[PDB]
């Protein structure tokens, strides 16, 4: 019941006091004028030294009532050009996958760091969208050029 709200509030406190440099994990305020912990708006910086560098990508995150029993649904908004991101923007990650690598120990900070490290490590063996995978396999430098173009588009 209150376990979900307490965990969300405590991890938000921790994020405010301690969080990685360049990330944002702001929980969107409820329309009435109070905190809405279910829906979070986050910002992930493209890892430095990679074509994704120089950009800050938004990411909405929705939690369930059974959290941390079930993982949260993460959706890039607008959707990114990545092999492992669905057209609707949902991010396919094993950690976020309920039945593969989900553990209540994992927190929002670790989820965001994993997503950041996913951007430069696409899993083309099992792609999530057709356009990104096709461009990745056909011509790699075209994929890099597209990634840089969108990063410039998504730059702060």
């Amino acid at each position: 019941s209150g376990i979900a709200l307490s965990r969300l509030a405590q991890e938000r406190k921790a994020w405010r006091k301690d969080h990685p440099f360049g990330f944002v994990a702001v929980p969107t305020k409820n329309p009435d004028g109070t905190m809405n912990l279910m829906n979070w708006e986050c910002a992930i910086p493209g890892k430095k030294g990679t074509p994704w560098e120089g950009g800050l990508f938004k990411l909405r995150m929705l939690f369930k009532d059974d959290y941390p029993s079930s993982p949260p649904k993460c959706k890039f908004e607008p959707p990114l050009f990545h092999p492992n991101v669905y057209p609707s923007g949902t991010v396919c990650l094993s950690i976020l996958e309920e039945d593969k690598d989900w553990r209540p120990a994992i927190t929002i900070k670790q989820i965001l760091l994993g997503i950041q490290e996913l951007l430069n490590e696409p899993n083309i063996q099992d792609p999530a969208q057709a356009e990104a995978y096709t461009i990745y396999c056909q011509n790699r430098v075209e994929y890099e050029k597209r990634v840089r173009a969108q990063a410039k588009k998504f730059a702060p």
Binding site: A14, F21, G22, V24
Partner: protein, 62 residues
Amino acid sequence: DVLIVYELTPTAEQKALATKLKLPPTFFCYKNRPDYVSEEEEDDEDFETAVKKLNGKLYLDG
């Protein structure tokens, strides 16, 4: 030989709290470090303000 020197551990109260929420044992270690102050409770932060605070800088430089 290969051995371990020290491993951090937070306060027992935070140990119990993490157990209650099934959080990592060392989750609360942040507040047990120096230069720690009372917990401001306003959280009047919107995504726009958080983006602005970055001031267009998000990467450390050497």
